[PDB]
């Protein structure tokens, strides 16, 4: 699970040395950017339900054909799997946002996704519609602090650029 | 002789083509810097004798053994002083020729070509001459672009000698 401290410990471990001052500066930067990350994590755990609700609502506001032909989530159950999947996604954005690297988001969500969305006839463009709605909606000084909003946007963009 | 015009024509002649716009622009620019060059040539021609006399006095004050050293090459004889102002007069005249031509042609074909064998075979050190050209560079008393011209060609003779 990739973070600042796991990269530097794993790198010095691959080296075969005790941690020099470089790793110490890296973890110093971890404890500098920490406050903005954890603020974003607090607000995400605050309103996750309304975020996922707006995400799925806009995702079917864009693409109506998922419902139209039994070739997508046309049964209330499949749309419940839809909002569940976006729940998983915001949960992984919260986890990578706490860790501060893209580690848990990559290994739990992104790694091996392509076989799953490919095999199970799941379109990625609809996911991207959901995330880009939750991305376009955000205001930096309206709710989140500027530094935390940046962190949030960055992580969500990572999800988009890892998806398609 | 190496004039800008003859460089232009000689290059186009070696290529066998005509004198297209490149060389014509070259002759234009020569015709513009030519005026300052001519003014500088006028004033060097004006005060030649005091430049030569002054330059020989500077060489004699810088190297005082030369008037004292008994020999053919040194300026102890009256003959030696005549050859002294003779040679300084040569350098001044070749500088005025290069000011008129606009390139270093006459100095490179009348003076620079073969100067080493002469300064060796008569044991004339390059440095004595350098001091002469420094006094000419100080006392020519031109101003502005004309002064940049004469300082250009005189400095050029200095960098030939060393």
């Amino acid at each position: 699970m990739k973070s600042v401290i796991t990269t530097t410990i794993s790198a010095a471990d691959a080296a075969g040395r005790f941690p020099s001052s470089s790793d110490l500066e890296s973890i110093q930067g971890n404890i500098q950017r920490a406050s903005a990350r954890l603020e974003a994590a607090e607000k995400l755990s605050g309103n996750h339900e309304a975020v996922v609700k707006e995400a799925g609502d806009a995702c079917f506001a864009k693409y109506s054909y998922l419902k139209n032909s039994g070739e997508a989530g046309d049964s209330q159950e499949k749309i419940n799997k839809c909002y569940r999947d976006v729940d998983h996604y915001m949960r992984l954005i919260n986890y990578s946002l706490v860790v501060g690297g893209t580690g848990p988001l990559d290994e739990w969500g992104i790694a091996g996704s392509r076989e799953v969305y490919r095999t199970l006839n799941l379109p990625g463009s609809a996911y991207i519609a959901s995330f880009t709605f939750t991305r376009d909606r955000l205001c930096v000084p309206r709710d989140m602090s500027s530094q935390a909003g940046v962190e949030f946007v960055a992580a969500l963009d990572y999800v988009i650029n890892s998806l398609s | 002789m190496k004039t800008p015009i003859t460089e232009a024509i000689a290059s186009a002649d070696s290529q066998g083509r005509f004198l297209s716009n490149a060389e014509l622009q070259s002759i234009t620019g020569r015709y513009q810097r030519a005026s300052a060059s001519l003014e500088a040539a006028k004033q060097l021609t004006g005060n030649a004798s005091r430049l030569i006399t002054g330059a020989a006095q500077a060489v004699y004050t810088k190297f005082p053994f030369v008037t004292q050293m008994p020999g053919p090459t040194y300026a102890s004889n009256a003959i030696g002083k005549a050859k002294c102002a003779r040679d300084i007069g040569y350098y001044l005249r070749m500088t005025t020729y290069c000011l008129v031509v606009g390139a270093t042609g006459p100095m490179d074909e009348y003076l620079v070509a073969g100067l080493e064998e002469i300064n060796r075979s008569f044991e004339l050190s390059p440095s004595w001459y350098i001091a002469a050209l420094e006094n000419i560079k100080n006392d020519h008393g031109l101003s502005g672009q004309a002064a940049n011209e004469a300082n250009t060609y005189l400095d050029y003779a200095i960098n030939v000698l060393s």
């Binding site: 806009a58 506001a61 864009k62 709605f133 376009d136 909606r137 | 440095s127 350098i130 001091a131 420094e134 200095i158 060393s162």
Partner: protein, 181 residues
């Protein structure tokens, strides 16, 4: 009409003086922004399709709730919907470009602020250069030859660390070359 009006901050720039320089391009842009025959509120957009009745070509709009994008350009819902008794003037983030009036490419536009920068190994010095000091000592050596100027000739001898004056190296100092030594 629905009047798609860009903000002041988005309007100004180099392409702005291009449009003030040309009547043709300016006319085509102003006709590109304005729709005829419809009055549209912010919440009446609703979907992703095209618009025909325009000069340039069909306009792509993506309408989702508020996150409205017009030609890929978002509109600002702070000052989007205004009554004008005949229409409504919706304000846009950017400039909608025609396929008619095409902007100049990057090589026609760009110049670097910092020169020679594809030729310099060191980015740190080139972007923040320090001032060059005096040059009197160095000019005294670069000017005249070695017999003309006497003592200065060494001039260019700068200062080595103390060990390099040492007996395996035996460096020289400028006081050695002078008559005073």
């Amino acid at each position: 009409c629905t009047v798609f009006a860009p903000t002041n901050g988005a309007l100004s720039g180099e392409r702005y003086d291009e449009l003030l320089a040309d009547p043709v391009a300016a006319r085509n842009v102003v006709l590109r922004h304005i729709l005829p025959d419809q009055v549209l509120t912010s919440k009446a957009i609703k979907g992703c399709s095209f618009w025909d009745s325009l000069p340039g070509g069909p306009l792509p709009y993506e309408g989702i709730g508020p996150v409205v994008k017009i030609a890929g350009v978002r509109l600002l819902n702070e000052s989007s919907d205004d009554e004008c008794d005949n229409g409504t003037i919706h304000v846009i983030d950017g400039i909608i470009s025609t396929p008619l009036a095409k902007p100049t490419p990057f090589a026609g536009v760009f110049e670097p602020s910092v020169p020679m920068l594809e030729s310099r190994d060191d980015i740190a010095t080139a972007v923040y250069p320090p001032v060059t000091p005096d040059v009197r000592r160095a000019f005294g050596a670069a000017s005249a030859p070695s017999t003309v100027g006497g003592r200065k000739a060494m001039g260019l001898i700068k200062q080595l660390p103390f060990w390099m004056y040492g007996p395996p190296f035996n460096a020289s100092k400028q006081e050695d070359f002078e008559p005073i030594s």
